């Protein structure tokens, strides 16, 4: 524990650009896709050892078995192991999420005391990419599934019906209560933790205003401390919607199983995508 | 094109490793018979017969071979020209490639001595 502590705090005041934390999550998520990418072992089922949702698996599978129609069917509709339809959906989610990272609001700025340089301040919707807000959505549902162990004495059944996703590709699986409450909690949790999150880790209305005055950048349209009212009609909604249509987006990470690991993989690669911007910044 | 070179070096350890033992396939490593107490510890590379291998023996051999060759590729492609960062990047390149070269040949020398029992 102390080692992960030291490695994280020597990658905030040290190198630190992404974090220590978020890039650990990102690389371990790269690995959790990657064990699904090439997969050497399979404990043998009723047929077909040593091929579990790899593309090598779905290239060794063409070398073993005849009747290539039922070689296609096991390649594209594999259930218990990872699937390649799963991998298409996984790729698809990556493409859409980088479609939505580029959602940004532009605001041009006359710098103070210099004639007409326009380094337009942007506001991206992902809005720190919600490394708070998803992990806000994750770790409360991790701390109880820690503390259900104290529920064994004094459970994985009746407490689960408002605890977890319903895990079923069948959209009309046997409980709509769990599905509705899970999705509504996901959406509301990320939106609510946006509208509560922005007030602490920067980039709220006064935060942006004092950083821009602090770096001598004034909006053209009006006076310097009306910049607040220039942009206070963006930041909460681009918190809240910026919360909301991530979690529903992770709904599309679960509703369709195109995710190697789900929600978390969408969002740790979102960490990476913001991370590339941070590294590029210093060129 | 150089992609043909990529294809060939891809094929290199692929047919150094186990195309010979695709049809004669011998499963990865377990052969101990309790040795005095503990039953089925997986042993090693095969040692007593020379021509045989397992899957785990062959892949390791192939990996050892192509990293050495592509280390020499890296010596050619960047270390002899003089264009990039002339004190930081270059020194890394000769450093890790010399580490590749020396420790690779050393370990492959070990992995012929111990399966082979050759007088060194």
């Amino acid at each position: 524990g102390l080692i992960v502590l030291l490695l994280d705090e020597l990658l905030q005041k040290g190198y630190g650009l992404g974090s220590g934390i978020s890039l650990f999550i990102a690389t371990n998520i790269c690995e959790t896709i990657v064990w699904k990418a090439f997969s050497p072992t399979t404990v043998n089922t009723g047929r077909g050892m040593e091929f579990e949702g790899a593309i090598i698996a779905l290239f060794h599978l063409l070398a073993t078995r005849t009747d290539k129609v039922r070689a296609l069917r096991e390649a594209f509709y594999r259930q218990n192991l990872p699937n390649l339809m799963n991998l298409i959906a996984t790729i698809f989610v990556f493409a859409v999420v980088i479609y939505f990272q580029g959602f940004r609001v532009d605001l041009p700025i006359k710098s103070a005391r210099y004639r007409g340089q326009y380094n337009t301040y942007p506001i991206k919707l992902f809005y720190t990419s919600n490394i708070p807000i998803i992990l806000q959505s994750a770790l409360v549902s991790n701390l109880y599934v820690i503390s259900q162990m104290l529920s064994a004495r004094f459970p994985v059944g009746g407490l689960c019906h408002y605890l977890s996703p319903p895990e079923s590709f069948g959209s009309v699986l046997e409980d709509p209560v769990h599905a509705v409450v899970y999705i509504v909690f996901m959406l509301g949790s990320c939106a609510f933790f946006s509208k509560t999150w922005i007030e602490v880790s920067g980039s709220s209305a006064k935060d942006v205003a004092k950083q821009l005055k602090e770096q001598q950048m004034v909006m053209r349209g009006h006076r310097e401390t009306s910049m607040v009212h220039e942009l206070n009609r963006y930041i909460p909604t681009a918190a809240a919607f910026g919360g909301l249509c991530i979690g529903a987006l992770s709904v599309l990470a679960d509703f369709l199983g195109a995710i190697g690991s789900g929600t978390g993989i969408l969002l740790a690669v979102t960490i990476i995508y913001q991370y590339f911007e941070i590294f590029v910044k210093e060129q | 094109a150089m992609t043909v070179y990529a294809l060939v070096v891809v094929s290199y350890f692929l047919i150094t490793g186990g195309i010979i033992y695709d049809v004669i396939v011998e499963p990865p490593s377990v052969g101990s018979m309790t040795d005095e107490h503990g039953h089925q510890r997986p042993v090693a590379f095969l040692a007593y017969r020379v021509n045989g291998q397992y899957i785990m023996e062959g892949l390791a051999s192939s990996f050892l071979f192509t990293m050495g060759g592509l280390g020499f590729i890296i010596l050619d492609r960047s270390n002899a020209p003089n264009i990039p960062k002339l004190n930081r990047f270059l020194l890394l390149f000769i450093g890790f490639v010399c580490v590749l070269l020396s420790f690779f040949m050393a370990r492959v020398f070990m992995r012929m001595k111990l399966p082979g029992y050759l007088m060194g």
Binding site: I3 | D35, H37
Partner: peptide, 29 residues
């Protein structure tokens, strides 16, 4: 890390795990 021992410290910790893992397994089989 003004110093690199923190890394070395981590390496020491892995070795302690590495060696101490098989060290008790020495007497077993």
């Amino acid at each position: 890390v003004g110093p690199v021992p923190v890394l070395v410290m981590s390496l020491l910790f892995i070795a302690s795990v590495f060696m101490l893992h098989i060290w008790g397994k020495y007497t077993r089989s």
